[PDB]
Design a protein around this ligand. Structure first.
Ligand code: SF4
Ligand code: SF4
Length: 77
């Protein structure tokens, strides 16, 4: 499962939408948030993101693992 981080935050980007097999990218407001728990781990959204920042949750540095929790949380409750 891959998740967004910091470099994605470019005021309502929307490239990662529609292409995802199960469209598990969501607006909080600022960006499109991937649900790691719905993401079936696939080489689309990251390749589409013109920054290369949608990394595996474990790959995302601890500082930014906060986002993995947020991305989890958003849709869990
Ligand atoms: S394409 Fe990248 S920058 Fe844009 S919303 Fe998605 S993850 Fe963030
Ligand atoms: S990695 Fe694939 S399944 Fe996962 S959020 Fe991205 S496009 Fe959707």
């Amino acid at each position: 499962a891959y998740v967004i981080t910091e470099p994605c935050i470019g005021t309502k980007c929307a490239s990662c939408v529609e292409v995802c097999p199960v469209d598990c990218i969501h607006e909080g407001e600022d960006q499109y948030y991937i649900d790691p728990d719905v993401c079936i781990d696939c080489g689309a959204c990251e390749a589409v993101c013109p920054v290369s920042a949608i990394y595996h949750e474990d790959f995302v540095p601890e500082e930014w693992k906060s986002y993995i929790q947020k991305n989890r949380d958003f849709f869990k409750k």
